[PDB]
Amino acid sequence: MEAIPVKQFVKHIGELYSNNQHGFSEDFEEVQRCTADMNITAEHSNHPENKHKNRYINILAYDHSRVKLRPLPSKHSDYINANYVDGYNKAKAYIATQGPLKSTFEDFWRMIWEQNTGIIVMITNLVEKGRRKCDQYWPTENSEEYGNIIVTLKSTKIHACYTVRRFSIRNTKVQNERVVIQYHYTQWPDMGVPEYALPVLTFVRRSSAARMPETGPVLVHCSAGVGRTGTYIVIDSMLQQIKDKSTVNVLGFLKHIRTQRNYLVQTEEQYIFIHDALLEAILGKET
């Protein structure tokens, strides 16, 4: 599949790092240019009624892959800045989305309900170095109402680098009650990428393993829902590919998902960090 054997992975890393990381720069420029001769529309994102529902004006939801809310008894009531994103050998394994705004809390929770999503992966802090990145769309304790969905915090589990929050959500218009587990990574740096890949590895595996059978896509968000979100999706997907085929196709998979949401894996640093992480994962398994 134009993939690399796991055994060659270590060697491939060497190459990409060699010659002042020329390999990595080529690869990421290819990722960046892979849309060059593709115009992917995001028209609903820029409809006047929907512009306030985007956290970042340049981070849009491609029309073709966007998650649509069921329309309401409400012109653009169907829009949320969210896109289906493929996982390894499974279409629409994820919903990549922005960290919701106060204004989109209802949309966000309704999407989770309507998509049969049971896992939230959140890869941001609410505020970072004094900068707002994400509004708190869950109750600090007990219940909160977001439109037709009431969210009850049931249990919280705080690890070194991530917090797990077990929520019970109920649709007041509907069974009516669903468990939704948020895995909240809490140690992503203000700037750049994590120095140590292992906590991120650990986070991916546990959050990934929480995906239960016959459930809707896992929702992954950070602030904008492209950089860290894209990084998560690639690491998780490639770990599945390694498990399933003992191969890796980071460049191939990423070029693919770039068509489904804009800027997934937003930086070359993120691109390299993916490789570091898979390297550590592979060398972990080897021992």
From Swiss-Prot:
The active site is at 222 (phosphocysteine intermediate). Residues 24-281 form the Tyrosine-protein phosphatase domain. It is found in: Membrane. It comes from the Eukaryota. Substrate binds at residues 190, 222-228, 266. Monomer; active form. Homodimer; inactive form. Interacts with CNTN3, CNTN4, CNTN5 and CNTN6. This is Receptor-type tyrosine-protein phosphatase gamma. It comes from Homo sapiens. The gene is PTPRG. The chain holds residues 825 to 1125 of 1445 of the full protein.
